[PDB]
Amino acid sequence: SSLKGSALGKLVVTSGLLHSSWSKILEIHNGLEFQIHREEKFTLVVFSAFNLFTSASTSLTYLKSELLQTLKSEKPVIITGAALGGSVASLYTLWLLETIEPTLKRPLCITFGSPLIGDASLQQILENSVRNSCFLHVVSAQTRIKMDFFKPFGTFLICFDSGCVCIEDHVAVTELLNGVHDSGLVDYSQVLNRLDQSMLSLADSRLIPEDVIKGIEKRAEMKNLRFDMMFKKLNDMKISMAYIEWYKKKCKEVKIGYYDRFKTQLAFPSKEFDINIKNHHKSELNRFWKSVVEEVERRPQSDASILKRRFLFSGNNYRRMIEPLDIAEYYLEGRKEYRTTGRSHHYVMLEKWFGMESILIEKERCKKRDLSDLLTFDSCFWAEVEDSLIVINQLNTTVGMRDDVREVLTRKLVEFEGYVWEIITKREVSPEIFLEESSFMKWWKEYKKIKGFNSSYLTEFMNTRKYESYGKS
Template sequence: MKDHISSAGLELANVLVTSPPLHQSWNAVLDQKQKLPPAADPNQKMALDISETKHSNTTIISFLTSPVTLHDQQAMVSLTPKNADFSLFEFLCGKNTSSFAVNELAINFFKLNLTNLDIWRKKLVESSKSSRIVITGHSFGGAVATLFTLWLLQSLDLSKAKRPLCITFGSPLIGDEQLRKCVLEFSTWSSCFLNVASINDPVPKVFLTSQGSGYKPFGTFLLCSSSGGSCIEDADAILQLLVETSSQCVQNPVPNSGTQLFDYGKILNDLKTKALFRDVFELVEEDRVPLNAGIKTQLAAILGVLSSQSLQQQQPHIKFESLIKKMVNHERKLEMQKMKDYSSFLKLNENKKYMANIEWYKKESKDMEIGYYDRYRNKRYPSDVIAEEFTKKLSIYWLDTVTEAESKPQKEGATMRIRFLYGGTNYRRMIEPLHIAEYYREGGKNYKEKRPRHFVLLEQWFDEEEKKKKEKREREERENPQPRSASKSNSKATSVATSLNDDSCFWVHVEEALILCNDLASNPDGRQKLIEFEHYVLDTLKNFAVTPDIFLPQSSFMQWWNKYKDIVGSSYSSELTDVMRRRTYRNYADGVSVLAGL
């Protein structure tokens, strides 16, 4: 893989330090501190002050905690289904990650202030529809702000609301690797977190006795010194930098974190001035590998070392070789992910072509007066083998897609499902009948007992979404009654000739009915089940929920009818048998009800 110059972290840092939201957030923290009483009540423990500042289209919510001593507060509590606090953040868990650990003090702060936090959450859900929300906090206030932002994100419909941004200053880490993985499961959530941390501030490192302490960062970190800064997203590199520079803070012991502030305002202003005057770090040239040169320059900027050649001499506690290796690997993983995303885009386009080929196969089968289900079941032509290849490729793609969506946390999985539900429903209705044809051609019975899970889930998700739409439609009709449109109720009738069966398992019912006809003598319940099948077919015809292909001369449905009419005899009468005997289905393809001629 070709190495690229890795200067994006420097460039992003320069953009951020000149952006108004970053400075406005820090000013909101300062203003909040100045408004608090000069002497805090020593008996008031775990108090949380939340303040609101407005700037045109941006609302800044700042968090400030009462002073806490962080030295001995590094313990994490594991949130599992058995834990009483689990329900607060259960939404983060998915199939692959069922539990995670969070700093115990942060959780306790959150619980004790839950009522007030919930009021703010509901308020921000409403305001996020029209205003950009920034959640901010300094030191331990930043830790609580981070938890609150996660809680807020799960309450928002991000297809309608603007994504909130959480900006923390000198915040300690709040959770473990499992929490980081949970956040990454949500495709857009990690980008909602910007953590500003000075290399000289002891608080971001306070829980990190070693890289094996259990804590792991997530989101983007603007690591900085008064000389420069760079943005890093690689959790392992961030962790190593924080741990290995902790010795620099020994002379600056961790204060009571809360109302005492490390001065990020001066650092941000210095970096803003440097960026505006282009007094910024430039790429080093002594390294022949551009990627390595870019990474060394980022590290020099973060650590305030003016020459990358003297990094090791000025920072002897940092293992630069392993650190650079981690950052190189991270950049390469990002490049591979871009290639994977592009590959997914290509696969999606390929699958559209496969579906188009199956649609053509369906049309060609209709012209042969057999229907694509029965043609595929018989497999007499070379084109049937080609259709089988397309079917396999489509099934592999959708099996992987559904499996990925199922493994996501509930909210992210639901968002993903809605995004592909239209395509997934078309796939299920078009391709599952061919899967059913293969199953019964090989002598199978009771298909639904062995139905592939991805078809089950696609149907379940579709039904859930349709139920939501129906409830919303009924609610809107109650609130704003309108005369019902006659054309709306006939929309399915006008398109029935080109549609797919609503029930992708329609042919299962037909196949099972054929089996019943053949085994009627040995099945005492067979006649009743055949009557139930009659009702099922009639309902689908009344609702124009099945295609006219079922009436083609060589279809399995017509095979069933030819057997069934001999079983029941001419004296038996029902709505469906009347439809079939009088052939009132002849104009069904034109949107005419099969009951019209009765």
């Protein structure tokens, strides 16, 4: 039942948080003058459209220092205001949290009957994210707020004849407060007194209809179903990745990298296993991981941990093993600059999360283990190679080219060679790149034909045939 809302309402009306905040607001009232009334622990500070926020930014730039200090101090931070001061405080707290870290104690912004124009885009961005957990509003059952461009953001506490009830369903909140706005604003002190009297009362009646609770329960059940369904489908995704593992093994057995094999198959389909791998497994894992990265980003699985290790470690391998296929597909259509121009979002998100997490690890690698089963760390590596190939063509087919573009391409080639030599020295690339019929050998042949007499570390390493003993021991 939805009464659970009113349940926590009781608690939010039992503590003197709202009462003390309203008393301080009345004292300050009875000009962006952010009066800080933090006595011992709390950070009670009243806020005194976009133009108002832009103007107040002058003092907000300095107040951010004290805000961050109080946040790091672990003291309770409360930010509220009037109809316009409340909206200004909501904007300030939203910006602070966008710049603040979720690790520390998150703030809470209460609006004292303060109308705020909420763009539908902003509401959809943080629809089910933890952001709304910081925003709460006061709306009396008598007065309503009818808006078209604006949208309700955060949770709303609707009063009644005796008591109050908190909710956060956007559609339900809109349907409840769908009524037109009333100019007459009852004294918030009278509302607080009535709420206190109701709390002291014996019993209270229910006013929420059945449709509201029906929709709320439907949304909760559907979200729980999505949660558990993704959790369970993780295992089927691992099982499907096992098939890609076996396919890569079989391709390696043929003396041809799986990347070039998949590229050739996409260019000229000639078998069924490749089509099944490209249209059955990859398309499912991509969608699953996209949905995961899109839904978890809103409301993380745990506080201070964007996601459990079971998911992050698996996603890292998924990326490092699948990104080459996306790079091949992107470079097969003619487009260039995959790393910067056409790289997906979930790949970068997973890479950044892994880089931020594994920093605390104390891993250690030996100089004797075999690298036959290693996975390239720089997933975009292949992409770079492709780019270089284009340059090679631009140096062979193109005739009568200006010296400026010539030197630019030469510098690009030399920098790519240096990068590849550096990545090889650190032993962070699988030996599969050294396969016979792989694109790497073609690029090496092109670079050798275009080099002439210039020699470097990579040139000698390739000519000496040492690459045969790269990962074998």
